[PDB]
């Protein structure tokens, strides 16, 4: 069975930082194809970023550079150190596993969702 943990919602301000976590069971985060996706009001299933099994990483246009991807091999969990955000980052981010490819990689799993509250 594959379980998903989406935690890290809270009172956040643009330009600051917090930390996000994704926990999985079964396979390992450092060896499978993971991809970050988000859902927002007025927005579709917006792809955020991805990490490759060989070590490489790839982000979207508006999230490259500011965000960083993080993972722990023995902890079998994955992290998103959200750093230097903007006000337009208010969304619900979902952790998922990309099987193949396409416009977005096919995700057989969906996260439980955590809603980012960019508000002061």
């Amino acid at each position: 069975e594959v379980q998903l943990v989406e935690t890290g919602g809270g009172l956040i301000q643009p330009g600051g930082s917090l930390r996000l976590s994704c926990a999985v069971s079964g396979f390992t985060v450092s060896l499978n194809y993971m991809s970050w996706v988000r859902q927002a009001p007025g927005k579709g299933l917006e792809w955020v970023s991805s990490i490759y099994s060989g070590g490489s990483t790839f982000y979207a246009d508006s999230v490259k550079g500011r965000f960083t991807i993080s993972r722990d091999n023995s902890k079998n969990t994955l992290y998103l150190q959200m750093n230097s955000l903007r006000a337009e980052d208010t969304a619900v981010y979902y952790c998922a596993r990309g099987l193949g490819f396409g416009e977005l990689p096919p995700f057989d799993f969906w996260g439980q969702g955590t809603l980012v509250t960019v508000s002061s």
């Binding site: 060896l31 194809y33 099994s53 060989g54 070590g55 490489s56 193949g100």
Partner: peptide, 8 residues
């Protein structure tokens, strides 16, 4: 090829 342990 799709999957590999590391980069070639």
């Amino acid at each position: 090829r799709l999957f590999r342990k590391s980069n070639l």
